[PDB]
Design a protein around this motif. Structure first.
Motif, PDB file in Angstrom:
ATOM      1  N   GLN A 114     148.082 -33.046  28.440  1.00 50.35           N
ATOM      2  CA  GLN A 114     148.868 -32.186  27.602  1.00 50.35           C
ATOM      3  C   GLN A 114     149.584 -31.093  28.392  1.00 50.35           C
ATOM      4  O   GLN A 114     150.436 -30.415  27.818  1.00 50.35           O
ATOM      5  CB  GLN A 114     148.004 -31.551  26.476  1.00 50.35           C
ATOM      6  CG  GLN A 114     147.268 -30.308  26.928  1.00 50.35           C
ATOM      7  CD  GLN A 114     146.108 -29.961  26.019  1.00 50.35           C
ATOM      8  OE1 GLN A 114     146.176 -30.138  24.808  1.00 50.35           O
ATOM      9  NE2 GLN A 114     145.027 -29.486  26.612  1.00 50.35           N
ATOM     10  N   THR A 115     149.278 -30.900  29.698  1.00 49.93           N
ATOM     11  CA  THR A 115     149.958 -29.960  30.566  1.00 49.93           C
ATOM     12  C   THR A 115     151.110 -30.553  31.354  1.00 49.93           C
ATOM     13  O   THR A 115     151.835 -29.805  32.028  1.00 49.93           O
ATOM     14  CB  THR A 115     148.981 -29.321  31.585  1.00 49.93           C
ATOM     15  OG1 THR A 115     148.712 -30.217  32.686  1.00 49.93           O
ATOM     16  CG2 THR A 115     147.686 -28.908  30.926  1.00 49.93           C
ATOM     17  N   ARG A 116     151.309 -31.869  31.280  1.00 50.61           N
ATOM     18  CA  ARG A 116     152.263 -32.487  32.198  1.00 50.61           C
ATOM     19  C   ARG A 116     153.688 -32.178  31.751  1.00 50.61           C
ATOM     20  O   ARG A 116     154.028 -32.338  30.578  1.00 50.61           O
ATOM     21  CB  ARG A 116     152.051 -34.014  32.189  1.00 50.61           C
ATOM     22  CG  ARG A 116     150.828 -34.478  32.994  1.00 50.61           C
ATOM     23  CD  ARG A 116     150.686 -36.009  32.933  1.00 50.61           C
ATOM     24  NE  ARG A 116     149.556 -36.563  33.696  1.00 50.61           N
ATOM     25  CZ  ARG A 116     149.650 -37.067  34.913  1.00 50.61           C
ATOM     26  NH1 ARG A 116     150.806 -37.093  35.565  1.00 50.61           N
ATOM     27  NH2 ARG A 116     148.549 -37.532  35.510  1.00 50.61           N
ATOM     28  N   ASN A 117     154.537 -31.764  32.699  1.00 47.87           N
ATOM     29  CA  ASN A 117     155.955 -31.505  32.418  1.00 47.87           C
ATOM     30  C   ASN A 117     156.715 -31.846  33.708  1.00 47.87           C
ATOM     31  O   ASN A 117     157.230 -30.949  34.403  1.00 47.87           O
ATOM     32  CB  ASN A 117     156.162 -30.057  31.972  1.00 47.87           C
ATOM     33  CG  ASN A 117     157.569 -29.780  31.514  1.00 47.87           C
ATOM     34  OD1 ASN A 117     158.393 -30.659  31.451  1.00 47.87           O
ATOM     35  ND2 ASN A 117     157.835 -28.519  31.182  1.00 47.87           N
ATOM     36  N   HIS A 118     156.746 -33.158  33.971  1.00 45.09           N
ATOM     37  CA  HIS A 118     157.261 -33.722  35.225  1.00 45.09           C
ATOM     38  C   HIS A 118     158.645 -33.192  35.553  1.00 45.09           C
ATOM     39  O   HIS A 118     158.936 -32.814  36.704  1.00 45.09           O
ATOM     40  CB  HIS A 118     157.301 -35.255  35.091  1.00 45.09           C
ATOM     41  CG  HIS A 118     157.616 -35.979  36.372  1.00 45.09           C
ATOM     42  ND1 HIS A 118     158.779 -36.688  36.573  1.00 45.09           N
ATOM     43  CD2 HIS A 118     156.902 -36.104  37.507  1.00 45.09           C
ATOM     44  CE1 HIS A 118     158.761 -37.230  37.781  1.00 45.09           C
ATOM     45  NE2 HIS A 118     157.627 -36.888  38.368  1.00 45.09           N
ATOM     46  N   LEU A 119     159.525 -33.178  34.551  1.00 48.55           N
ATOM     47  CA  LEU A 119     160.928 -32.826  34.754  1.00 48.55           C
ATOM     48  C   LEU A 119     161.201 -31.344  34.566  1.00 48.55           C
ATOM     49  O   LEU A 119     162.347 -30.905  34.741  1.00 48.55           O
ATOM     50  CB  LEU A 119     161.812 -33.669  33.812  1.00 48.55           C
ATOM     51  CG  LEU A 119     161.615 -35.191  33.968  1.00 48.55           C
ATOM     52  CD1 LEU A 119     162.577 -35.947  33.041  1.00 48.55           C
ATOM     53  CD2 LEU A 119     161.781 -35.664  35.433  1.00 48.55           C
ATOM     54  N   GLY A 120     160.182 -30.530  34.337  1.00 46.00           N
ATOM     55  CA  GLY A 120     160.393 -29.100  34.236  1.00 46.00           C
ATOM     56  C   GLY A 120     161.230 -28.680  33.057  1.00 46.00           C
ATOM     57  O   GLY A 120     161.992 -27.722  33.155  1.00 46.00           O
ATOM     58  N   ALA A 121     161.113 -29.387  31.953  1.00 43.71           N
ATOM     59  CA  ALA A 121     161.915 -29.139  30.755  1.00 43.71           C
ATOM     60  C   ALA A 121     161.399 -27.910  30.012  1.00 43.71           C
ATOM     61  O   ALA A 121     160.196 -27.792  29.737  1.00 43.71           O
ATOM     62  CB  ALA A 121     161.871 -30.364  29.842  1.00 43.71           C
ATOM     63  N   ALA A 128     166.006 -35.114  22.916  1.00 46.67           N
ATOM     64  CA  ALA A 128     165.152 -34.073  23.502  1.00 46.67           C
ATOM     65  C   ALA A 128     164.919 -34.277  24.990  1.00 46.67           C
ATOM     66  O   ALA A 128     164.695 -33.287  25.722  1.00 46.67           O
ATOM     67  CB  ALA A 128     163.817 -34.050  22.731  1.00 46.67           C
ATOM     68  N   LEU A 129     164.912 -35.519  25.427  1.00 47.36           N
ATOM     69  CA  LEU A 129     164.869 -35.854  26.864  1.00 47.36           C
ATOM     70  C   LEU A 129     166.115 -35.359  27.591  1.00 47.36           C
ATOM     71  O   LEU A 129     166.030 -34.613  28.583  1.00 47.36           O
ATOM     72  CB  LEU A 129     164.755 -37.391  26.971  1.00 47.36           C
ATOM     73  CG  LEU A 129     164.902 -37.940  28.390  1.00 47.36           C
ATOM     74  CD1 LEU A 129     163.645 -37.643  29.222  1.00 47.36           C
ATOM     75  CD2 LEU A 129     165.093 -39.437  28.353  1.00 47.36           C
ATOM     76  N   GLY A 138     155.036 -38.677  26.862  1.00 38.65           N
ATOM     77  CA  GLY A 138     155.170 -39.767  27.824  1.00 38.65           C
ATOM     78  C   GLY A 138     156.386 -40.619  27.575  1.00 38.65           C
ATOM     79  O   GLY A 138     157.385 -40.516  28.311  1.00 38.65           O
ATOM     80  N   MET A 139     156.339 -41.485  26.583  1.00 42.17           N
ATOM     81  CA  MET A 139     157.401 -42.471  26.411  1.00 42.17           C
ATOM     82  C   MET A 139     158.767 -41.821  26.201  1.00 42.17           C
ATOM     83  O   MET A 139     159.733 -42.209  26.857  1.00 42.17           O
ATOM     84  CB  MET A 139     157.078 -43.396  25.217  1.00 42.17           C
ATOM     85  CG  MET A 139     157.983 -44.605  25.148  1.00 42.17           C
ATOM     86  SD  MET A 139     157.704 -45.562  23.625  1.00 42.17           S
ATOM     87  CE  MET A 139     156.069 -46.176  23.991  1.00 42.17           C
ATOM     88  N   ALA A 140     158.879 -40.843  25.279  1.00 40.33           N
ATOM     89  CA  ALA A 140     160.190 -40.288  24.977  1.00 40.33           C
ATOM     90  C   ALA A 140     160.648 -39.254  25.998  1.00 40.33           C
ATOM     91  O   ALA A 140     161.804 -39.283  26.434  1.00 40.33           O
ATOM     92  CB  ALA A 140     160.192 -39.677  23.577  1.00 40.33           C
ATOM     93  N   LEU A 141     159.775 -38.302  26.399  1.00 37.03           N
ATOM     94  CA  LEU A 141     160.247 -37.212  27.242  1.00 37.03           C
ATOM     95  C   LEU A 141     160.093 -37.466  28.730  1.00 37.03           C
ATOM     96  O   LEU A 141     160.561 -36.651  29.525  1.00 37.03           O
ATOM     97  CB  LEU A 141     159.512 -35.918  26.887  1.00 37.03           C
ATOM     98  CG  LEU A 141     159.741 -35.447  25.456  1.00 37.03           C
ATOM     99  CD1 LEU A 141     159.091 -34.052  25.296  1.00 37.03           C
ATOM    100  CD2 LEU A 141     161.226 -35.410  25.033  1.00 37.03           C
ATOM    101  N   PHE A 142     159.401 -38.543  29.130  1.00 37.67           N
ATOM    102  CA  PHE A 142     159.171 -38.817  30.570  1.00 37.67           C
ATOM    103  C   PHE A 142     158.489 -37.639  31.250  1.00 37.67           C
ATOM    104  O   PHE A 142     158.599 -37.455  32.464  1.00 37.67           O
ATOM    105  CB  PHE A 142     160.468 -39.204  31.273  1.00 37.67           C
ATOM    106  CG  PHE A 142     160.274 -40.013  32.526  1.00 37.67           C
ATOM    107  CD1 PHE A 142     159.805 -41.316  32.431  1.00 37.67           C
ATOM    108  CD2 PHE A 142     160.583 -39.492  33.760  1.00 37.67           C
ATOM    109  CE1 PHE A 142     159.627 -42.077  33.554  1.00 37.67           C
ATOM    110  CE2 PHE A 142     160.430 -40.281  34.904  1.00 37.67           C
ATOM    111  CZ  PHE A 142     159.948 -41.581  34.760  1.00 37.67           C
ATOM    112  N   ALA A 143     157.766 -36.840  30.502  1.00 42.22           N
ATOM    113  CA  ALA A 143     157.154 -35.641  31.065  1.00 42.22           C
ATOM    114  C   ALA A 143     155.879 -35.923  31.834  1.00 42.22           C
ATOM    115  O   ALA A 143     155.342 -34.999  32.455  1.00 42.22           O
ATOM    116  CB  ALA A 143     156.864 -34.614  29.928  1.00 42.22           C
TER     117      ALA A 143
END
Ligand SMILES: Cc1cc2nc3c(=O)[nH]c(=O)nc-3n(C[C@H](O)[C@H](O)[C@H](O)COP(=O)(O)OP(=O)(O)OC[C@H]3O[C@@H](n4cnc5c(N)ncnc54)[C@H](O)[C@@H]3O)c2cc1C
Ligand SMILES: Cc1nc2c(=O)[nH]c(=O)nc-2n(C[C@H](O)[C@H](O)[C@H](O)CO)c1C
Ligand code: SF4
Ligand SMILES: [Cl-]
Ligand code: NA
Ligand code: NA
Ligand code: NA
Ligand code: NA
Ligand code: NA
Ligand code: NA
Length: 516
Positions: free
Chosen positions: A333-340, A384-385, A416-421
């Motif tokens: 729940q902390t993951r934000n790969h792309l820094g969005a 949103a992505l 995951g699937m939608a935001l690639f986060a």
């Protein structure tokens, strides 16, 4: 001074076949409760509150008719207690229980709250919900933490394990595992005239709404006097039968289609079984078995692509996202790969956008508590992505607004699937698309204020430029995958002037994102 054992049933634990109920015990008290705390962790759709509250009362009625001792506490009764732990402790003391048992919850927050419950003089046990196909204890071996387990490989293993759509010698029925390439048709005009009427129930909810309001419970969305969603197991079974007879013959064919035209556009050929499954009124085994039985009895009128397309979502995606959630929480729940970090635009709460696609998906979410999968993924999710919306804010919207949303399934699909986060842990590649995708799969662009054939400048579809700005921003991350690298040729072939006009249009639309 009255029961030896108290057993809790949570609102998504409405499994009528649970082994608890296989015996009648006068020394066991079942508790089911409307809970303020369960309205406070996210702001739910009013229809979701109505559906769970109606279903919890209906399950209590079923259990009582079957001779089990059950107390159903509505908000007026449960408001006497501070929270769920206090309610449990006080009732156990009231009836002089020796033992308290519960079914393992399906959100990390609630599993943790119940795991940390301590009751003076009382033994606590936790049992399975007896619902999912994959046993919970196998999740660590099937889903190593922080490993990008491929859904397709997990799905093939599940197909073999349960025998669904398998040949006598262990091969996939129909010569391939996955028929998704056959399941990508748009609805043409003759198809729209043939769309079936969705099965809607007439469940009155005025008293439930009044109770919610009396307790100043916050909600989102709208509902009238009657709720169309199934609220008991009979209604869920009726929906399953409706799906098998009326919708399954075209479920795969139009699985990715969207329309703004038809009155039944909100449902199309989807099953709408997700709430019934996630509340455990239905099991995935029985839904899979029913649809395969209907397929085999239809003598060719249900093609294999339809039933494999359906089964893959329940046997494959649903079981997969559960495993990935439990293996990777709470870190996931902390993951934000792309820094969005962008705020979710305000029209997510009212539908007031000039992008027809977004307007249709948001409005139906507000008015029905439901959007079908390609809307969740390729309309609001893609938007949103591409606009780099804060995943925490996106999660709060999806988890609250959809009647079927419980975190174990919302979070991997959204973050995951939608935001690639998660950087591809759940679904490998970003599901980014321009307006050309929406135009191919829908009739939205024919009823839109923007022009899908324009990439830059005045009146251009915002997805066209936002798509390229996103893909260029992440080119170094994404160009290693070879199929996507092709996309960067489409771009690299454009003139400097055209590339710049597109990126300038994207920045202008982002600066005016509230006005889109
Ligand atoms: C961003 C995003 C958020 C989502 N959040 C949720 C959610 O909170 N709850 C939820 O149940 N599904 C969620 N989904 C998955 C899917 O979109 C819904 O299950 C589907 O829209 C429910 O409609 P239906 O019952 O008509 O499904 P159908 O199209 O009839 O599909 C059949 C069944 O397959 C299952 N299913 C389909 N796709 C998935 C999937 N990707 N993951 C899990 N199960 C799936 C459901 O049990 C569904 O009832 C989400 C998908 C996305 C992209
Ligand atoms: C809206 C809602 N209300 C309740 C409630 O009042 N009481 C209850 O027992 N469960 C409720 N639920 C389900 C829980 O919030 C939670 O999502 C699931 O129990 C997780 O497994 C929901 C989703
Ligand atoms: S033109 Fe663009 S904004 Fe309008 S419906 Fe098509 S994809 Fe959506
Ligand atoms: Cl046509
Ligand atoms: Na509280
Ligand atoms: Na009774
Ligand atoms: Na046409
Ligand atoms: Na899906
Ligand atoms: Na959380
Ligand atoms: Na995938």
């Amino acid at each position: 001074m009255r029961y030896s054992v108290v057993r809790l049933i949570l609102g998504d634990q409405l499994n009528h076949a649970h082994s608890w109920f296989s015996e009648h015990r006068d020394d066991v008290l079942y508790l089911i409760a409307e809970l303020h705390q369960e309205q406070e962790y996210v702001r739910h759709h009013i229809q979701k509150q109505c559906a769970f509250f109606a279903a919890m009362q209906a399950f209590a009625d079923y259990l009582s008719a079957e001779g089990h001792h059950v107390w159903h506490l509505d908000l007026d009764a449960s408001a006497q207690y501070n929270d769920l732990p206090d309610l449990i402790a006080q009732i156990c003391q009231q009836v002089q229980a020796d033992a308290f048992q519960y079914q393992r919850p399906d959100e990390y927050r609630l599993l943790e709250q119940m795991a940390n419950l301590r009751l003076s003089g009382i033994t606590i046990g936790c049992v399975d919900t007896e619902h999912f196909l994959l046993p919970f204890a196998e999740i660590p071996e099937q889903f190593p933490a922080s490993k990008a387990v491929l859904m397709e490989h997990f799905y093939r293993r599940m197909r073999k394990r349960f025998g669904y759509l398998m040949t006598a010698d262990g091969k996939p029925e129909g010569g391939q595992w996955n028929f998704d390439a056959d399941n990508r048709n748009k609805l043409k005009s003759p198809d729209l005239l043939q769309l079936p009427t969705p099965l809607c129930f007439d469940n009155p909810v005025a008293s439930i709404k009044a109770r919610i309001e009396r307790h100043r419970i916050p909600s989102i969305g709208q509902v009238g006097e009657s709720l169309l969603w199934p609220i008991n197991r009979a209604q869920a079974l009726s929906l399953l039968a409706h799906f098998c007879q009326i919708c399954l013959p075209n479920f795969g064919r139009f699985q990715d289609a969207m329309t703004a035209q038809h009155p039944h556009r909100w449902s199309l050929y989807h099953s709408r079984l997700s709430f019934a499954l996630n509340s455990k009124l239905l099991s995935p085994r029985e839904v899979i078995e029913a649809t395969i039985s209907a397929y085999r009895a239809a003598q060719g009128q249900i093609s294999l692509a339809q039933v494999e397309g359906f089964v893959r979502q329940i046997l494959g995606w649903r079981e997969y996202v559960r495993g990935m959630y439990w293996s990777n929480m709470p870190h996931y729940q902390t993951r934000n790969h792309l820094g969005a970090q962008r705020p979710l635009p305000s029209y997510f709460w009212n539908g007031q956008t000039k992008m027809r696609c977004l307007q249709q998906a948001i409005t139906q979410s507000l008015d029905f508590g439901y959007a079908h999968h390609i809307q969740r993924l390729m309309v609001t999710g893609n938007f949103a992505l591409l606009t780099e919306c804060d995943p925490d804010q996106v999660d709060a919207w999806y988890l609250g607004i959809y009647i079927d949303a419980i975190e174990w399934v919302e979070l991997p699909n959204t973050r995951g699937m939608a935001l690639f986060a998660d950087g591809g842990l759940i679904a490998t590649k970003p599901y980014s698309a321009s307006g050309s995708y929406i135009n191919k799969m829908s009739d939205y662009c024919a009823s839109c204020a923007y022009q899908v054939k324009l990439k830059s400048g005045e009146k251009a579809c915002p997805l066209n430029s936002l798509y390229w700005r996103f893909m260029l921003k992440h080119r170094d991350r994404l160009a290693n995958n070879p199929r996507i690298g092709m996309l960067y040729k489409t771009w690299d072939k454009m003139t400097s002037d055209s590339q710049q006009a597109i990126l300038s249009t994207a920045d202008a639309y982002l600066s005016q994102i509230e006005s889109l």
